[PDB]
C-alpha cells in the first residue's frame, strides 16, 4: 500500500544523514540487448551464430567505447577471456544456492541480484547441476554509466549463454515441487555482469538475469493452483468480459 | 521406595554360569590427575595394585588416563551393554581396591528392587496344581444331579 496520513502524523523531517549511503551497485540494467527472434534455429549452426556475435561486437560503436573506458581505467583487461570467468561466476553462484552459503554468495553476486535469487527460495531445498554448455559463452555488449557526482563508472558486460542444467526444488517438508533432477534441461540465459571501477577492490559480479521476449514458457509445475475471481460485497453485481 | 522404582525379576545375563561362568565385566576406564590431591588414592592404586589386578582378570581391559581432571572417576562397562559410572574421588587404596572388586563381580544388571529371590524355570516338576487334581472322579463322569 502507498498511504500517508497528513492529517495528524505530520511529515518525517528532511534529514542530512552524516554518511552518504554507499552503494556497491546500481539496480538498473541500462541497455538491454534484445536477441534475434530466430536465435533458436541459428543456435544449431555454429559459424552462423558465432559470426553474428563477433561481428556485432566489432561493429558496435557503443560497445567499443565502453570497452575503451574499461580498458583505459583498468589495465590487463580482455574481452576474449571474459566469457570464461563469467561462465565460472555462474557455476559458483548456483553451487552456492545449493549449499546455501551466503557469505560467498555476497562476494560473487551484486546488490540487485541477491534479494531475488535468495528470497523466495530460502526455506526450500535447492539442488542444481551444470553438465554441458552446448554453445560456449558469448559476449554480447558492454555499457558504461557515468555518474557525474561520484566520478564512479559502472561497467556492465552482457553474456548470452546456452547451457544444460538439472534443477530439483523440494518443498520444506521434503517433497518435490518444480522439476526432476534427472532431466538435464536445455536453457538459454541472457545474463548481465557488473563491476565498479573507481573501487580499488574491483570485484567482478553477477548483476542481473534477463529473459528475452519470445523465450520458451518454463516447465509445468506439479501442483494444481486456483485463481480466484474478485471478492464480491453483497450489493456489488458481477460482470463477465468477452 | 518400592512403588517408586522399576523392578526386575532375578536373572542371569545370557544364562551365565550354567555352562561356564564368564566374568561379565568388560572394560574399566580410570581418569585421574598426576597432580591433583583428589586423585591421591587412585594414583597409588594405579601404581601398586592395577598391575596385579590385571593379571587376576584376563577378561577385562583397563584404560588408565592421567588428564587434567579434578574428580577422579572410573567407568565400568559390561557385556550386557550396560555401563556404570563411579567416583574414586578422595578414597584410600584399600577403598578403591574394594570398589573395583565390587565392579568385578556384578551382573551389569541394574540395581532395582528384585521382586523375588529365586528365578526358576518350570518349578512344577511332577505337576502343577489345578482344581481337579485332588478330586475323585465318578462313574460315567456324571454331574452331581445328572441321571442316565
Amino acid at each position: 500500500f502507498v498511504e500517508h496520513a497528513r492529517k495528524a502524523g505530520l511529515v518525517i523531517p528532511h534529514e542530512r544523514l552524516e554518511r552518504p549511503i554507499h552503494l556497491a551497485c546500481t539496480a538498473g540494467i541500462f541497455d538491454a540487448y534484445v536477441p534475434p527472434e530466430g536465435d533458436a534455429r541459428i543456435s544449431s549452426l555454429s559459424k552462423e551464430g558465432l559470426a553474428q556475435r563477433a561481428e556485432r561486437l566489432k561493429k558496435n560503436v557503443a560497445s567499443q567505447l565502453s570497452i575503451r573506458k574499461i580498458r583505459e581505467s583498468d589495465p590487463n583487461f580482455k574481452i576474449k577471456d571474459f566469457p570464461e570467468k563469467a561462465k565460472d561466476i555462474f557455476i559458483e553462484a548456483h553451487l552456492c544456492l545449493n549449499n546455501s552459503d551466503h557469505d560467498r554468495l555476497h562476494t560473487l553476486v551484486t546488490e540487485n541480484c541477491f534479494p531475488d535469487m535468495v528470497w523466495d527460495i530460502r526455506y526450500k531445498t535447492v539442488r542444481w547441476s551444470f553438465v554441458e554448455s552446448l554453445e560456449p559463452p558469448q559476449v554480447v555488449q558492454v555499457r558504461c554509466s557515468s555518474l557525474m557526482n561520484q566520478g564512479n563508472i559502472y561497467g556492465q558486460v552482457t553474456v548470452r549463454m546456452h547451457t544444460r542444467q538439472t534443477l530439483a526444488i523440494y518443498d520444506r517438508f521434503g517433497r518435490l515441487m518444480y522439476g526432476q533432477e534427472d532431466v538435464p534441461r536445455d536453457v538459454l540465459e541472457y545474463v548481465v555482469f557488473e563491476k565498479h571501477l573507481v573501487d580499488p577492490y574491483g570485484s567482478w559480479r553477477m548483476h542481473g538475469k534477463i529473459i528475452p521476449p519470445w523465450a520458451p514458457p518454463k516447465q509445468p509445475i506439479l501442483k494444481t493452483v486456483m485463481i480466484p475471481g474478485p471478492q464480491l460485497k453483497p450489493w456489488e453485481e458481477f460482470e463477465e468480459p468477452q | 521406595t518400592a512403588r517408586g522404582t522399576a523392578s526386575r525379576f532375578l536373572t542371569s545375563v545370557l544364562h551365565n554360569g550354567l555352562g561356564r561362568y564368564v566374568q561379565q565385566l568388560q572394560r574399566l576406564s580410570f581418569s585421574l590427575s598426576r597432580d591433583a590431591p583428589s586423585s591421591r588414592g587412585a594414583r597409588e592404586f594405579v601404581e601398586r595394585e592395577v598391575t596385579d589386578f590385571a593379571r587376576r582378570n584376563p577378561g577385562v581391559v583397563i584404560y588408565v588416563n592421567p588428564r587434567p581432571c579434578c574428580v577422579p572417576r572410573v567407568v565400568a562397562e559390561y557385556l550386557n551393554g550396560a555401563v556404570r559410572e563411579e567416583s574414586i574421588h578422595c578414597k584410600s587404596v584399600e577403598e578403591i581396591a574394594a570398589l573395583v572388586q565390587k565392579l568385578a563381580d556384578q551382573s551389569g544388571l541394574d540395581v532395582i528392587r528384585i521382586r523375588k529371590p529365586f528365578h526358576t524355570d518350570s518349578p512344577s516338576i511332577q505337576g502343577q496344581w489345578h482344581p481337579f487334581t485332588n478330586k475323585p472322579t465318578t462313574l460315567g463322569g456324571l454331574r452331581p444331579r445328572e441321571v442316565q
Binding site: 480466484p228 475471481g229 463477465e240 | -
Partner: protein, 295 residues
C-alpha cells in the same frame, strides 16, 4: 474354458489396469490445462490443472468441501461429467446437485449407478454351481416407481421366484456394500479390447457391439467400483455412500422367445433427500409392480 469365479475377477481387473496404465502411457508428462467456473456461485474462477489426471472432483477442493459433499455431477460444456473422470482439454465447469432446479441429468445418472450396484450385488449372491448371465440396465424415467436390472439364470433355476427372505438378503448385502465406501471410476475403451473383458456373457457382448456401433470410433464406456465392472450409458454418481435408503423391492420374470429373463425392481434415495418412514413405505409399495420402458 474351465474358469473359477475368482479368476474371472482377476482377469477383468488386470485387463482394466492394463488399459488404465495405457491411457497413462500416452506420455503426457504433466501438461497444464485450464478451466473456468461458469457456476452461479463463484464467478471469475479459474483452475490450472493437470491434463488427463486432475478431476472435476479435485477441482471442487480449491473451492470448499461443501461442493464435495454436495455435488454429484459436473456439467462441462453441455455434458454431464462424472466427478472422478479426468478432464481432457481446457474447458468451462459448472457443478450439479440433487436440490438444483433441473436435476434430470443427475437423476438419470443416479438411477444408473443404483442399478449397477444391484447388478453386482446379484451376481455374487448366487452359488458357484449356477450361472448368472447379467444382461443390461434398462433406463427408466424417475416417475417410474423403481429402478430395474435384467438377469438370466441357470436353466434348472428357472422354476423358483424369490421370498422376502432372499430379497431382504439382497438388501442387507446392498447396504453392506454402501457401508464400505467405494469410488465410481470411468474408463473409455475401444471395442476390440472391451469385448475381451466380458467374453462369456453373450448379451453383454451384444450390447457392447450395439453401443460401439452407434458411436463412430467404436467407443465403449466402462464403469468400475471395487471388483465389479459394468458398461453403462452416461455418467455415475461420485461415491457409493451417497445412497442411504436402499432396496430390492420385487422381481418379475419376463420371457422373450429366445430367452428367459428376470427383472429386478428396486428403490433407493440419497442421504440428502432422505425420506421419512411412512413416505418411504409408500414409495416401496409403488415399487412393487412391473415397470416396463425399454423404448
Amino acid at each position: 474354458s474351465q474358469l473359477s469365479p475368482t479368476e474371472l475377477i482377476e482377469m477383468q481387473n488386470d485387463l482394466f489396469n492394463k488399459e488404465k496404465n495405457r491411457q497413462l502411457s500416452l506420455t503426457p508428462r504433466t501438461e497444464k490445462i485450464e478451466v473456468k467456473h461458469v457456476g452461479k456461485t463463484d464467478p471469475g474462477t479459474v483452475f490450472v490443472m493437470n491434463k488427463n489426471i486432475s478431476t472435476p472432483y479435485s477441482c471442487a477442493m480449491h473451492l470448499s468441501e461443501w461442493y464435495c459433499r454436495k455435488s454429484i455431477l459436473a456439467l462441462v460444456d453441455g455434458q454431464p461429467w462424472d466427478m472422478y473422470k479426468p478432464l481432457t482439454k481446457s474447458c468451462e465447469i459448472k457443478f450439479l446437485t440433487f436440490k438444483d432446479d433441473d436435476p434430470g441429468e443427475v437423476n438419470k445418472a443416479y438411477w444408473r449407478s443404483c442399478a449397477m450396484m444391484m447388478g453386482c450385488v446379484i451376481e455374487r449372491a448366487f452359488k458357484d454351481e449356477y450361472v448368472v448371465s447379467l444382461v443390461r440396465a434398462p433406463e427408466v424415467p424417475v416417475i417410474a416407481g423403481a429402478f430395474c436390472y435384467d438377469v438370466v439364470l441357470d436353466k434348472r433355476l428357472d422354476e423358483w421366484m424369490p421370498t422376502k427372505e432372499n430379497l431382504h438378503s439382497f438388501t442387507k448385502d446392498a447396504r453392506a456394500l454402501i457401508y464400505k465406501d467405494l469410488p465410481f471410476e470411468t474408463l473409455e475403451v475401444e471395442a476390440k479390447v472391451a469385448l475381451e473383458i466380458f467374453q462369456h456373457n453373450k448379451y453383454k457382448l451384444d450390447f457392447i457391439e450395439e453401443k460401439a456401433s452407434q458411436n463412430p470410433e467404436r467407443i465403449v464406456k466402462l464403469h468400475r467400483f471395487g471388483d465389479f465392472i459394468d458398461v453403462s450409458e452416461g455418467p455415475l454418481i461420485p461415491r457409493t455412500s451417497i445412497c442411504f435408503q436402499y432396496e430390492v423391492s420385487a422381481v418379475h420374470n419376463l420371457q422373450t422367445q429366445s430367452s428367459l429373463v428376470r427383472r429386478f425392481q428396486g428403490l433407493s434415495l440419497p442421504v440428502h433427500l432422505r425420506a421419512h418412514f411412512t413416505i418411504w413405505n409408500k414409495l416401496l409399495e409403488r415399487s412393487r409392480k412391473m415397470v416396463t420402458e425399454d423404448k
